[PDB]
PDB file of C-alpha atoms and ligand atoms in Angstrom:
ATOM      1  CA  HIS B   2       0.244  -0.271  -0.371  1.00 36.47           C
ATOM      2  CA  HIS B   3       3.027   1.868   0.277  1.00 33.66           C
ATOM      3  CA  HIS B   4       5.824   2.266  -1.762  1.00 31.88           C
ATOM      4  CA  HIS B   5       3.478   2.053  -5.710  1.00 31.47           C
ATOM      5  CA  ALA B   6       4.699   4.754  -6.164  1.00 30.12           C
ATOM      6  CA  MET B   7       5.547   8.824  -6.001  1.00 25.64           C
ATOM      7  CA  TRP B   8       4.138  12.307  -6.766  1.00 24.64           C
ATOM      8  CA  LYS B   9       6.205  15.092  -8.326  1.00 23.40           C
ATOM      9  CA  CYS B  10       6.061  19.006  -9.242  1.00 23.65           C
ATOM     10  CA  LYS B  11       5.485  19.791 -11.864  1.00 21.74           C
ATOM     11  CA  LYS B  12       7.679  23.028 -12.402  1.00 23.83           C
ATOM     12  CA  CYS B  13      10.849  21.576 -10.343  1.00 23.76           C
ATOM     13  CA  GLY B  14      10.676  17.583  -9.577  1.00 28.48           C
ATOM     14  CA  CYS B  15      10.437  16.978  -5.980  1.00 30.67           C
ATOM     15  CA  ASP B  16       8.400  14.852  -4.535  1.00 31.23           C
ATOM     16  CA  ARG B  17       8.366  15.980  -0.867  1.00 33.35           C
ATOM     17  CA  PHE B  18       5.016  18.212  -0.274  1.00 33.27           C
ATOM     18  CA  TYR B  19       3.210  20.275   1.919  1.00 33.98           C
ATOM     19  CA  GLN B  20      -0.440  20.281   3.921  1.00 32.10           C
ATOM     20  CA  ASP B  21      -0.825  23.671   5.589  1.00 29.49           C
ATOM     21  CA  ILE B  22      -3.401  23.517   8.089  1.00 31.32           C
ATOM     22  CA  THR B  23      -5.871  26.073   7.742  1.00 32.03           C
ATOM     23  CA  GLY B  24      -7.440  25.485  11.126  1.00 29.14           C
ATOM     24  CA  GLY B  25      -9.368  23.569  13.430  1.00 29.19           C
ATOM     25  CA  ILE B  26     -10.156  22.763  17.754  1.00 26.98           C
ATOM     26  CA  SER B  27      -8.661  21.141  21.033  1.00 26.29           C
ATOM     27  CA  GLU B  28     -10.686  19.328  23.356  1.00 24.90           C
ATOM     28  CA  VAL B  29      -9.177  19.945  25.961  1.00 24.37           C
ATOM     29  CA  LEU B  30      -9.003  16.530  28.057  1.00 25.29           C
ATOM     30  CA  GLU B  31      -6.365  16.998  30.981  1.00 26.40           C
ATOM     31  CA  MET B  32      -4.122  20.856  31.939  1.00 26.03           C
ATOM     32  CA  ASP B  33      -1.815  21.175  35.001  1.00 25.37           C
ATOM     33  CA  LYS B  34      -1.594  23.980  37.626  1.00 22.25           C
ATOM     34  CA  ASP B  35       1.234  25.969  35.975  1.00 23.00           C
ATOM     35  CA  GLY B  36      -1.368  25.919  32.421  1.00 26.60           C
ATOM     36  CA  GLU B  37       0.097  23.297  30.234  1.00 27.10           C
ATOM     37  CA  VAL B  38      -2.292  21.108  27.822  1.00 30.63           C
ATOM     38  CA  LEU B  39      -1.710  16.930  28.716  1.00 29.98           C
ATOM     39  CA  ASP B  40      -4.335  15.934  26.915  1.00 27.37           C
ATOM     40  CA  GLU B  41      -6.046  16.841  24.009  1.00 26.58           C
ATOM     41  CA  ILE B  42      -8.375  15.776  20.718  1.00 25.99           C
ATOM     42  CA  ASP B  43      -7.984  18.223  17.660  1.00 25.48           C
ATOM     43  CA  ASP B  44      -9.558  18.191  14.712  1.00 23.70           C
ATOM     44  CA  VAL B  45      -7.507  20.596  12.036  1.00 27.16           C
ATOM     45  CA  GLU B  46      -8.410  21.539   8.856  1.00 26.02           C
ATOM     46  CA  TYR B  47      -6.317  21.181   5.823  1.00 26.23           C
ATOM     47  CA  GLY B  48      -6.085  23.189   3.441  1.00 23.37           C
ATOM     48  CA  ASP B  49      -3.577  23.347   0.452  1.00 20.39           C
ATOM     49  CA  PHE B  50      -0.414  21.383  -0.783  1.00 20.05           C
ATOM     50  CA  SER B  51       2.305  22.950  -1.803  1.00 18.21           C
ATOM     51  CA  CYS B  52       5.960  21.863  -3.173  1.00 17.57           C
ATOM     52  CA  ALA B  53       8.436  22.073  -0.250  1.00 16.37           C
ATOM     53  CA  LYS B  54      10.894  23.144  -2.979  1.00 15.15           C
ATOM     54  CA  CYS B  55       9.212  25.482  -4.769  1.00 16.43           C
ATOM     55  CA  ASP B  56       6.000  26.760  -2.894  1.00 14.33           C
ATOM     56  CA  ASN B  57       3.951  25.614  -5.914  1.00 16.56           C
ATOM     57  CA  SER B  58       0.662  25.378  -4.151  1.00 17.29           C
ATOM     58  CA  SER B  59      -2.949  24.270  -5.047  1.00 16.70           C
ATOM     59  CA  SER B  60      -5.550  23.289  -3.392  1.00 20.14           C
ATOM     60  CA  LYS B  61      -5.499  19.791  -5.703  1.00 22.38           C
ATOM     61  CA  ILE B  62      -2.467  17.678  -5.740  1.00 21.83           C
ATOM     62  CA  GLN B  63      -2.782  17.277  -9.785  1.00 21.09           C
ATOM     63  CA  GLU B  64      -2.310  20.400 -10.625  1.00 22.55           C
ATOM     64  CA  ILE B  65       0.582  21.086  -9.364  1.00 25.84           C
ATOM     65  CA  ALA B  66       2.282  17.445  -9.746  1.00 25.84           C
ATOM     66  CA  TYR B  67       2.410  14.492 -11.247  1.00 24.48           C
ATOM     67  CA  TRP B  68       2.518  10.924 -10.449  1.00 23.43           C
ATOM     68  CA  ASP B  69       5.721   8.966 -11.478  1.00 20.54           C
ATOM     69  CA  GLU B  70       4.684   4.777 -11.024  1.00 21.81           C
ATOM     70  CA  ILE B  71       7.848   3.077  -9.735  1.00 24.66           C
TER      71      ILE B  71
ATOM     72  CA  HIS S   1       1.675  12.737  36.576  1.00 26.91           C
ATOM     73  CA  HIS S   2      -0.331  15.850  37.167  1.00 30.56           C
ATOM     74  CA  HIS S   3      -3.046  14.838  35.694  1.00 31.05           C
ATOM     75  CA  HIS S   4      -5.655  13.944  38.295  1.00 28.13           C
ATOM     76  CA  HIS S   5      -3.306  17.672  40.630  1.00 28.28           C
ATOM     77  CA  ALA S   6      -6.595  18.984  39.985  1.00 26.40           C
ATOM     78  CA  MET S   7      -8.714  21.310  37.192  1.00 24.50           C
ATOM     79  CA  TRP S   8      -9.853  24.358  35.840  1.00 23.34           C
ATOM     80  CA  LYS S   9     -12.452  26.405  35.905  1.00 24.14           C
ATOM     81  CA  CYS S  10     -14.513  28.982  33.861  1.00 20.33           C
ATOM     82  CA  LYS S  11     -14.331  32.435  36.716  1.00 21.76           C
ATOM     83  CA  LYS S  12     -18.069  32.673  34.696  1.00 22.75           C
ATOM     84  CA  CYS S  13     -19.294  29.155  34.142  1.00 21.51           C
ATOM     85  CA  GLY S  14     -18.018  27.254  36.601  1.00 21.60           C
ATOM     86  CA  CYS S  15     -17.805  25.159  33.834  1.00 19.65           C
ATOM     87  CA  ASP S  16     -14.620  23.143  33.790  1.00 18.48           C
ATOM     88  CA  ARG S  17     -14.025  22.256  29.742  1.00 18.59           C
ATOM     89  CA  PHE S  18     -12.778  24.011  27.203  1.00 20.61           C
ATOM     90  CA  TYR S  19     -11.556  24.624  23.640  1.00 17.34           C
ATOM     91  CA  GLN S  20      -8.327  25.351  22.185  1.00 19.46           C
ATOM     92  CA  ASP S  21      -8.253  27.622  18.898  1.00 20.65           C
ATOM     93  CA  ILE S  22      -5.992  25.608  15.974  1.00 21.78           C
ATOM     94  CA  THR S  23      -5.013  29.679  14.298  1.00 20.91           C
ATOM     95  CA  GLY S  24      -3.493  27.182  12.142  1.00 23.13           C
ATOM     96  CA  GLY S  25       0.262  25.412  11.304  1.00 23.53           C
ATOM     97  CA  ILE S  26       1.806  23.251   8.514  1.00 21.82           C
ATOM     98  CA  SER S  27       1.908  19.636   7.474  1.00 25.29           C
ATOM     99  CA  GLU S  28       4.348  17.227   5.811  1.00 26.05           C
ATOM    100  CA  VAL S  29       2.764  14.754   3.737  1.00 23.65           C
ATOM    101  CA  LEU S  30       4.896  11.534   3.443  1.00 24.07           C
ATOM    102  CA  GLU S  31       3.309   9.441   2.090  1.00 26.14           C
ATOM    103  CA  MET S  32      -0.021  10.486  -0.438  1.00 24.44           C
ATOM    104  CA  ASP S  33      -1.993   7.750  -2.859  1.00 26.12           C
ATOM    105  CA  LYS S  34      -2.488   7.351  -6.667  1.00 26.69           C
ATOM    106  CA  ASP S  35      -5.792   8.814  -6.062  1.00 23.68           C
ATOM    107  CA  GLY S  36      -4.228  12.220  -4.082  1.00 20.68           C
ATOM    108  CA  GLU S  37      -5.141  10.961  -0.464  1.00 21.65           C
ATOM    109  CA  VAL S  38      -2.588  11.280   2.084  1.00 23.86           C
ATOM    110  CA  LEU S  39      -1.878   8.759   4.021  1.00 23.29           C
ATOM    111  CA  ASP S  40       1.779   9.138   6.855  1.00 22.11           C
ATOM    112  CA  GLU S  41       1.066  13.074   7.986  1.00 21.80           C
ATOM    113  CA  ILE S  42       3.317  15.049  10.166  1.00 19.50           C
ATOM    114  CA  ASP S  43       1.761  17.507  11.705  1.00 21.40           C
ATOM    115  CA  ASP S  44       2.686  21.243  13.280  1.00 22.53           C
ATOM    116  CA  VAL S  45      -0.339  22.770  14.648  1.00 19.86           C
ATOM    117  CA  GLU S  46       0.083  26.332  16.113  1.00 21.53           C
ATOM    118  CA  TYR S  47      -2.438  26.936  19.008  1.00 22.38           C
ATOM    119  CA  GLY S  48      -4.625  29.477  20.509  1.00 21.78           C
ATOM    120  CA  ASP S  49      -6.542  30.925  22.481  1.00 20.89           C
ATOM    121  CA  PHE S  50      -8.485  28.952  25.680  1.00 25.41           C
ATOM    122  CA  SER S  51     -12.875  29.867  24.911  1.00 19.44           C
ATOM    123  CA  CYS S  52     -14.985  28.518  27.690  1.00 14.11           C
ATOM    124  CA  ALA S  53     -17.578  25.361  26.020  1.00 13.47           C
ATOM    125  CA  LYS S  54     -20.721  27.794  27.476  1.00 14.31           C
ATOM    126  CA  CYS S  55     -19.421  30.390  28.403  1.00 16.17           C
ATOM    127  CA  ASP S  56     -17.296  30.951  25.617  1.00 15.77           C
ATOM    128  CA  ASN S  57     -14.851  32.948  27.763  1.00 13.76           C
ATOM    129  CA  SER S  58     -11.893  33.381  26.058  1.00 14.76           C
ATOM    130  CA  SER S  59      -8.083  34.341  26.071  1.00 14.13           C
ATOM    131  CA  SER S  60      -4.600  33.793  25.164  1.00  9.50           C
ATOM    132  CA  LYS S  61      -3.888  32.769  29.040  1.00 13.76           C
ATOM    133  CA  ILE S  62      -5.946  30.592  30.943  1.00 11.27           C
ATOM    134  CA  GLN S  63      -5.492  31.749  33.299  1.00 14.70           C
ATOM    135  CA  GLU S  64      -7.612  34.590  32.936  1.00 12.13           C
ATOM    136  CA  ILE S  65     -10.635  33.139  32.631  1.00 12.54           C
ATOM    137  CA  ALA S  66     -10.506  29.963  34.473  1.00 13.29           C
ATOM    138  CA  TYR S  67      -8.849  29.480  38.131  1.00 10.70           C
ATOM    139  CA  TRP S  68      -7.102  26.378  39.109  1.00 14.66           C
ATOM    140  CA  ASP S  69      -8.947  24.811  41.696  1.00 12.55           C
ATOM    141  CA  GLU S  70      -7.103  22.147  44.171  1.00 11.45           C
ATOM    142  CA  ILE S  71      -7.837  18.535  44.485  1.00  8.67           C
ATOM    143  CA  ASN S  72      -6.317  18.212  47.771  1.00  7.61           C
TER     144      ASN S  72
HETATM  145 ZN1   ZN U 101       8.092  22.070  -7.264  1.00  4.16          ZN
HETATM  146 ZN1   ZN U 102     -17.873  29.427  30.690  1.00  4.24          ZN
END
């Protein structure tokens, strides 16, 4: 289910991509007297993909990248 | 462990359950499918302001919206 292939930036050839976290919410389950969250349940919203080398970004990886099979 | 030392309580509600906003950070995709779906990811979330789960009393500091009770 892995190592089947790889996406590559259509502009620079990088195969390592980011995904912006747009927002979300944390359900704090435990905190300490000093005020630090120790246990939580996050529900992050994911956003546009980006290229680690050139920053080519879009909502869909397809526009910014191609699938190179191994 | 500090996991039962006590509880924070809203200075308006008395509620002990708080949220923390996610201002948003960056994720690091490590495995994506031919369909374009993320499998493995390393998220670097940036957290924001606490908000009471009832009041909505909110601040960047839990100490401004709540007080620490003590289980003793
Ligand atoms: Zn690129
Ligand atoms: Zn409250």
